[PDB]
């Protein structure tokens, strides 16, 4: 039905209108803590805040604020943590969160710099031989390896708690070619990237929620998560076609504002869920066709 639905909307060109309806109907919950004066400097954007009911709380008894939201998708049974791109002063908080929430993967969908603007801090080591230490949160971070592809890069990081001298492996999945307020090049490139993430196990129920961010943590992040959850649902339901993408997006917006920032991102999500259904419904070969089409070399 969603492909039937997708057809009417394109045919009549109503993406902007359909998108404005989602915006009109989205939830509005208080952001009290995010707005406290002492937390001014912990927010990259003063108009993108986590809701109080779903914000992630740092376990430091001084100030527990981080701009980050737990997105708990019940029917689909996946949780994601959506966050803003760490600021030079909240890098220690970010990794505190990753440690405390027991996350195994981090998905970064932006670049540190876009159109000459600073969009995110360099919060992970670019060189094996130069590790990072976050003094405020007593954590250590070390680049272990990095498989670089044409449009993304997977890294293996070692995060160590200096307090307890325990270490974990964190996988880092950086999509380098997704412009702010833009879409990926193709459904193929996106889906190929999403499936690399799934295949790493980082999304396994046995780990904390994967951390997903871009600069603000709503647009590309929202797009990434919607598509994933919708595909998840088409798998579970005895009826894959029933899945209403607009409804899933509204469910998700109960947990963080603004998810999906443009009408073209919404359109893209349909493309990606539709295409990705092919795999859900048995076409084994289709995944190799996204690898050849995404041009990951």
């Amino acid at each position: 039905e969603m492909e039937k639905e997708f057809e009417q909307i394109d045919k009549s060109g109503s993406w902007a209108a359909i998108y404005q309806d989602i915006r009109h109907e989205a939830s509005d919950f208080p952001c009290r803590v995010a707005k406290l004066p002492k937390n001014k400097n912990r927010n990259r954007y003063r108009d993108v805040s986590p809701f109080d009911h779903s914000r992630i709380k740092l376990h430091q008894e001084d100030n527990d604020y981080i701009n980050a939201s737990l997105i708990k998708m019940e029917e689909a049974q996946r949780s994601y943590i959506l966050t803003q791109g760490p600021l030079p002063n909240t890098c220690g908080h970010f990794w505190e969160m990753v440690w405390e929430q027991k996350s195994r993967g981090v998905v970064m969908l932006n670049r540190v710099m876009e159109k000459g603007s600073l969009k995110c801090a360099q919060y992970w080591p670019q060189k094996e031989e130069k590790e990072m230490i976050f003094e405020d949160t007593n954590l250590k971070l070390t680049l272990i390896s990095e498989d670089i592809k044409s449009y993304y890069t997977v890294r293996q990081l070692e995060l160590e708690n200096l307090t307890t001298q325990e270490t974990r492996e964190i996988l880092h999945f950086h999509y380098t070619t997704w412009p702010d307020f833009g879409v990926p090049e193709s459904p193929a490139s996106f889906l190929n990237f999403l499936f690399k993430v799934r295949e790493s196990g980082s999304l396994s129920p046995e780990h904390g929620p994967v951390v997903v961010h871009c600069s603000a943590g709503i647009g590309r992040s929202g797009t990434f998560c919607l598509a994933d959850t919708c595909l998840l649902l088409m798998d579970k339901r005895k009826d894959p076609s029933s899945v209403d993408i607009k409804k899933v997006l509204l469910e998700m917006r109960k947990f963080r504002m603004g998810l999906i920032q443009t009408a073209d991102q919404l359109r893209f999500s349909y493309l990606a869920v539709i295409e990705g259904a092919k795999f859900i419904m048995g076409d084994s070969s289709v995944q190799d066709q996204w690898k050849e089409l995404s041009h990951e070399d």
């Binding site: 927010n43 990259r44 954007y45 003063r46 108009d47 993108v48 600069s215 603000a216 709503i218 603004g258």
Partner: peptide
């Protein structure tokens, strides 16, 4: 400003 995404 710069502290606004929207």
């Amino acid at each position: 400003d710069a502290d606004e995404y929207l």
